[PDB]
Design an enzyme around this catalytic site. Sequence first.
Site, PDB file in Angstrom:
ATOM      1  N   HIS A 135       0.860  -1.177   0.000  1.00 41.66           N
ATOM      2  CA  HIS A 135       0.000   0.000   0.000  1.00 41.66           C
ATOM      3  C   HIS A 135       0.895   1.225   0.000  1.00 41.66           C
ATOM      4  O   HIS A 135       1.988   1.197   0.583  1.00 41.66           O
ATOM      5  CB  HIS A 135      -0.830   0.101   1.290  1.00 41.66           C
ATOM      6  N   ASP A 175       2.367   1.908   3.413  1.00 44.13           N
ATOM      7  CA  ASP A 175       3.376   0.979   3.921  1.00 44.13           C
ATOM      8  C   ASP A 175       4.784   1.481   3.529  1.00 44.13           C
ATOM      9  O   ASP A 175       5.765   1.278   4.271  1.00 44.13           O
ATOM     10  CB  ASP A 175       3.218  -0.407   3.288  1.00 44.13           C
ATOM     11  N   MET A 192       2.375  -5.952  -7.977  1.00 37.45           N
ATOM     12  CA  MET A 192       1.087  -5.443  -7.594  1.00 37.45           C
ATOM     13  C   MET A 192       1.281  -4.353  -6.556  1.00 37.45           C
ATOM     14  O   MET A 192       2.200  -4.411  -5.704  1.00 37.45           O
ATOM     15  CB  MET A 192       0.172  -6.574  -7.047  1.00 37.45           C
ATOM     16  N   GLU A 228     -10.963  -6.550  -4.720  1.00 39.54           N
ATOM     17  CA  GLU A 228     -10.743  -7.579  -3.707  1.00 39.54           C
ATOM     18  C   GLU A 228     -11.986  -7.532  -2.812  1.00 39.54           C
ATOM     19  O   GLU A 228     -12.175  -6.570  -2.050  1.00 39.54           O
ATOM     20  CB  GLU A 228      -9.490  -7.222  -2.899  1.00 39.54           C
ATOM     21  N   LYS A 269     -14.602  -8.661   0.280  1.00 42.35           N
ATOM     22  CA  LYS A 269     -14.577  -9.242   1.650  1.00 42.35           C
ATOM     23  C   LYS A 269     -16.002  -9.027   2.204  1.00 42.35           C
ATOM     24  O   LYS A 269     -16.612  -7.979   1.923  1.00 42.35           O
ATOM     25  CB  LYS A 269     -13.543  -8.481   2.541  1.00 42.35           C
ATOM     26  N   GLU A 311      -9.511 -13.589  -1.980  1.00 46.49           N
ATOM     27  CA  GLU A 311      -8.628 -14.064  -0.900  1.00 46.49           C
ATOM     28  C   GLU A 311      -9.251 -15.296  -0.241  1.00 46.49           C
ATOM     29  O   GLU A 311     -10.458 -15.297   0.043  1.00 46.49           O
ATOM     30  CB  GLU A 311      -8.462 -12.980   0.162  1.00 46.49           C
ATOM     31  N   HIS A 369     -11.212 -14.549   3.005  1.00 47.97           N
ATOM     32  CA  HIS A 369     -12.397 -13.696   2.763  1.00 47.97           C
ATOM     33  C   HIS A 369     -13.647 -14.518   2.364  1.00 47.97           C
ATOM     34  O   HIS A 369     -14.721 -14.327   2.980  1.00 47.97           O
ATOM     35  CB  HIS A 369     -12.133 -12.526   1.762  1.00 47.97           C
ATOM     36  N   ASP A 395      -4.999 -13.926  -3.591  1.00 46.05           N
ATOM     37  CA  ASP A 395      -4.351 -13.764  -2.289  1.00 46.05           C
ATOM     38  C   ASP A 395      -4.540 -15.053  -1.478  1.00 46.05           C
ATOM     39  O   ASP A 395      -5.684 -15.519  -1.301  1.00 46.05           O
ATOM     40  CB  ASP A 395      -4.970 -12.623  -1.482  1.00 46.05           C
ATOM     41  N   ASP A 434     -11.317 -12.332  10.621  1.00 48.60           N
ATOM     42  CA  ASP A 434     -10.351 -12.629   9.579  1.00 48.60           C
ATOM     43  C   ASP A 434      -9.023 -13.004  10.249  1.00 48.60           C
ATOM     44  O   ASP A 434      -8.337 -12.142  10.819  1.00 48.60           O
ATOM     45  CB  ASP A 434     -10.243 -11.404   8.701  1.00 48.60           C
ATOM     46  N   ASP A 468      -6.166 -14.529   8.919  1.00 45.09           N
ATOM     47  CA  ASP A 468      -4.898 -14.342   8.144  1.00 45.09           C
ATOM     48  C   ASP A 468      -3.793 -15.319   8.557  1.00 45.09           C
ATOM     49  O   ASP A 468      -2.651 -14.902   8.696  1.00 45.09           O
ATOM     50  CB  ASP A 468      -4.356 -12.894   8.301  1.00 45.09           C
ATOM     51  N   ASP A 527      -1.249 -12.908   1.648  1.00 45.37           N
ATOM     52  CA  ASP A 527      -1.712 -11.812   2.488  1.00 45.37           C
ATOM     53  C   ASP A 527      -2.083 -12.492   3.801  1.00 45.37           C
ATOM     54  O   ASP A 527      -3.152 -13.021   3.920  1.00 45.37           O
ATOM     55  CB  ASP A 527      -2.921 -11.108   1.871  1.00 45.37           C
TER      56      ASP A 527
END
Lengths: 385, 385, 385, 385
Positions: free
Chosen positions: B52, B55, B86, B179, B181, B215, B218, B243, B253, B255, B285
């Site tokens: 991002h 980030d 990406m 994306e 969710k 994802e 998700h 993802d 979530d 992860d 991710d």
Amino acid sequence: YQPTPEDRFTFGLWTVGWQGRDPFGDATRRALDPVESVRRLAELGAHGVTFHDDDLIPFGSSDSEREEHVKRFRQALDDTGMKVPMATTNLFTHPVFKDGGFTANDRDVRRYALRKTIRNIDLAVELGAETYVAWGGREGAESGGAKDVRDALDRMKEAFDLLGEYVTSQGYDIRFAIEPKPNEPRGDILLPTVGHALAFIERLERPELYGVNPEVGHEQMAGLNFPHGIAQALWAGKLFHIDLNGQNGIKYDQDLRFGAGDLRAAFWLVDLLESAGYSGPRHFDFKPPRTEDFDGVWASAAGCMRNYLILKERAAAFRADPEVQEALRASRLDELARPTAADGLQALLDDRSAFEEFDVDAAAARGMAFERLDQLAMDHLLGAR
Amino acid sequence: YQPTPEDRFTFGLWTVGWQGRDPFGDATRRALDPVESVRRLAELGAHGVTFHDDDLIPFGSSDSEREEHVKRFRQALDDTGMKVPMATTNLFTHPVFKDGGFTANDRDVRRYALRKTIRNIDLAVELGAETYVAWGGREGAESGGAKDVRDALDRMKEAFDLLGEYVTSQGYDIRFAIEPKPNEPRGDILLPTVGHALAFIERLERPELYGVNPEVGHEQMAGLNFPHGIAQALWAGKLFHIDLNGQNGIKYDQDLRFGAGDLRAAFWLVDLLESAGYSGPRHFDFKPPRTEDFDGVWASAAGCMRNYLILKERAAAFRADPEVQEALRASRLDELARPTAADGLQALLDDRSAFEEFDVDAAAARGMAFERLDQLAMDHLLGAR
Amino acid sequence: YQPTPEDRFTFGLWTVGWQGRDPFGDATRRALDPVESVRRLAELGAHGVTFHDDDLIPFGSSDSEREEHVKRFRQALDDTGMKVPMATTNLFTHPVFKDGGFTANDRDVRRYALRKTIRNIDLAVELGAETYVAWGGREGAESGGAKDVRDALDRMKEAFDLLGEYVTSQGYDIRFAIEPKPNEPRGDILLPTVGHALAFIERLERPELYGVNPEVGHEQMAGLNFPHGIAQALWAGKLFHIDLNGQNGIKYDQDLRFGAGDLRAAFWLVDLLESAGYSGPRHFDFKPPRTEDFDGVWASAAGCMRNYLILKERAAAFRADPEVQEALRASRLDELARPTAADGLQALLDDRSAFEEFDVDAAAARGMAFERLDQLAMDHLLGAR
Amino acid sequence: YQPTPEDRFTFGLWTVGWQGRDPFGDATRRALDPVESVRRLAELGAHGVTFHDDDLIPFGSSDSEREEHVKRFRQALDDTGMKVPMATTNLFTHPVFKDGGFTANDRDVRRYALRKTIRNIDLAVELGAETYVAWGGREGAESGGAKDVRDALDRMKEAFDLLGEYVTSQGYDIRFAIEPKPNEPRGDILLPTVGHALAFIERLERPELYGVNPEVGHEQMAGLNFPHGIAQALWAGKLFHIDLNGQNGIKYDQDLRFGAGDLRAAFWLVDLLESAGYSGPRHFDFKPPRTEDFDGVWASAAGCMRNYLILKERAAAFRADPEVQEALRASRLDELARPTAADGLQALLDDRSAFEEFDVDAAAARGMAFERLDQLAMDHLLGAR
């Protein structure tokens, strides 16, 4: 809160007619003659009824038995003024459909599924139906290797294209509505949500002939917001029909009467349908619980309609309330309806108030006032204004 | 099972860089310098990293601080041979986005969201990114009256059309991936599943520039079958990126690293991606659990890749096994791939073997042999053949 | 529907004080001084407030800073007439508790957890608290090998026995309430439901000192019926405290205001608490959504109380309605309250009307009349009688 | 991975005998004679079979028909060496049980339920059963007013106390196991989880005669961790029996063969049962999918056993691996098994290293090394060590 045929309330033969057989239990009620359900529903204020082929004409019926079942049914409709706005095919009950109808691995079964459907489209048209629903309840899998999903979607597309070719070649005024469900009776069902069904329609040869028939309990079995899914369907111009019932969360498909289950979701659904001016049938696909006798069956059906009319009153009172209209502006619902950049891309790029000189902290500090708005909605739902 | 850059494994800066802050707890790890994550990932065998805007370049950075963060990052990429396939925008962390970015009720916020995204598309292109992801994590609502979903989807469409206009006017070779969710951090998020996102893309001005970036965790938060959703995405030609992570059912979530969570779903996902010849990045991710120190971070990242390569071996062994090829015919997977009615509608209508003389009981009695096929798949996954 | 301190409504400091930090986002509101929340809550009609040690006295505070935080707080309670009926320990936020407090694998951490709790029990007693809550939010695991659950339950039992030994040795009039949650922030949390917590209490050395503090949203995250779980807790004499909020199904812990989420569940919960004569605090453990500014915070808190008082009125109207009392007999709720066999085992064995001459079909045909009863409950909830 | 009767694998008559009737579909398979299932199971390597009264002796059978069904069954057991370690009552299928058996609102039904159960306890004892299971699948409600849960739990306690009085008065060596399920076929079922059932047992007159019979798919329908629930049951000394199958998440009860569904949960369950030395039957309560013919039925049953034996090998290899034993110490599983404060309360209070001089940051910085441990567990499960 008395319904009349103008409210467009409809019921499946298989709803009030459900005998109460579940995975763990025998029937608790005798079978209903379809003619009796037509008469009892009309007395309750319903507008019409719907049917699977096999609800009206017992599977395996000879041509003559068939004509007689249809004749009796047609006399009950004439006697009562009941309409038949929607019909559908049973492609799930008979063992031949144990791996699906349109996407069965066996090619002979798929061809059979298509012929069984076409026979019933001719009946539906004769009876005056405007929408023909397809619920592919057996299209899916319990295990990963049993169904190649790309090949299955090719077969699904092929089936629906052939049906569109048939309807257009016959000059029929009927459209199709795909009814998604995420699971049950298959471990996972293909086109599991409203979104999947909408995306699929866009790949058919004549997308204009197909829409969706979403069901309250179905989307809630995936934990999704039903009013949000219906708003997307309306946004796409694809809400051809809707099925109303109640569901308490993610579990087996309960088919409770409408208003039961998630009551606030029912409120927001009614608010949406009424404010978007949806003009289709309000169809109830529910089951009176097997705890009930026939009196409980009719009380259950009557409760479906009653709860819709109560929610309609409360939603209309909510939107009409000047204090709510003021709350909606306080929450900037009016600004959500205005284009972000009708001035265009270049003007946006050149607009220093959109970035270089945008005060992000001042914007961040503005409260959205959603909780006051939601409590106004609660007070209206509960008649506590 | 050693990865090499040819396996196309990628990681978010924010993945191994996650400090361990959760809704109930403070950070357990210090911040990672992006340059350090690039070097550590390259040693592990990764192909590249993603980011991002926020980030890489701390929110609020001056133009000069920005150039310096990019310069350092670019030197680490040159030093290691890592790619950036990406990139994406953070439209969720800063308080200004508390009611969304592209579908915030406040028009000024929406215009800001667009300008923040466009700035980062120019960066992504400079860094060589082929896909630009959009996760609208704040687009949604906790209450029914706060968001009119039709107006929100108008705003969402308007945002994505403006982005497509920008990319095409600049002559950029970059495509967008939405994306989905279903919930978290909003009570319900707009475009909640792969299906909703696919259906939405079909209403944009230039649908060919947009696909999906689904994802694992998700779709599983809606209890959906992830390999089935990916098969539909592939069928539509819209799987631009994917993802990978792990999730144990319907809950927050998690992860988890890839392979953790639903292991058999991971197997069937790998089988699909490899057999469909997906050629995009395999992006992870995930978050190393906050129980871990830095050594556990790298062990977690390495485990993502290892589990993919083990599953790839087992899926390839499964499809190559003559006993499995024979089982797949026994289960009529070959017949599923053949057209139902390439002979056409009329020939089907005239074919008495499709209905009048179709022996439904004989067809019904044929077992599908799916359980033997699924046990062959289990034996292959477990190395017990 | 105006609350007064007699209604026994209480709130956590951490509820209205929640700054809006979520897994994906920064704080949207400034910190509240506890003294300000006490004053604002008292104006709203609350009876009292609750606290974790770390809400009142910042972690790491010196002994002198501590005395000053307590002094200020005590002055606000004296100024307003607010009580502190419950307190609890924060064993989840600081990184040291990343693998738990009472069941951390590290023995030093467990001993620390106990000492931190004991310090706060002395404070709670001083402030007049009657119940001390324990929510083991970090007791659990993301992976199977990380926690041997038998050994963890030994450590959990050991911790609670030591706490009971401390309270009894000090002569304190305080009881403990265990607050179950199924997951979040750990992948699975030990004692995940009301049932697990009740069963666990029965193995402690002094079970009479421990009960449960169930939370609406917590049981609903496991898809369980909250009123049913509370009825079992009451049946066991173990409902020492209760936490009220709203939750839309199985997903992350939403902490919506009470009445939001599953509205019909809230109705049935209020009916139960009022008819069983529960006399404890009605405590709200909720979070005003981070969309809100301070005005939305207070509106959210006020809505918690309002919705309880509306539901109380409707439930009382329901039970008082002669038509409902008649429906309850029609449904044999009166027969459910009569012993099955007060005549004893032998008399039952000898009673031919219980088996040999029992007419099962006649019994089977009796409808239960539950749907008419449930529609009477809907009409009462909605004020549509 | 060949089972032998020493592995103690058992199956319900109703499992391989399931005809394939589901809520949406007719039977796909003919009925099996119980004698044939006994012979076919014995050839597969099973140790024994279980039954509901109504599986063995058709409902309504005369005394003479009964003796003949039992005689034939007993001859098949003698011919094959098969045992009957567990039996149970069908209190769910017949319409008379539509509102429950032990907690039906109608008192006559409850008395009938008890007499039907007692008749079958005498049969079970005669056949050599050591455990008598009770699954109250109809005890529950679809609506809030239909069942007062406190009165229902009084009736449930009364039923189980009468059964304990009967067994003890007859001098029978049989114990009871309560089988919890959260929902289906009722909208919510009383005693919905292992925890609820354990807590309930502690209020019966003779708690030592009752334990639990948990089922994989049942706890997973509430999204709970099955190995964690079994560890609590073992900790309480209450795991009298266990039912093994597969379930993909929160949805209808799928009853997949064991190993299917959540494969990693199956691994951790096997690790626990084997390391705790559980010595009871490994019973499979599953349904071969209705897609299958008889050959698929037996393949499905054989797969249950195979998957248990594969998982047993992998779990044993995991615990035996010196590298895993070293990882378990690295993660302080050894410290979890040591008492927190065997030195006692006062010594803890006086120990400055537990608080005053405890270095919380140094403790906080220690990583738990759980991800390396979990990847070792993955590598062992997959045979990739």
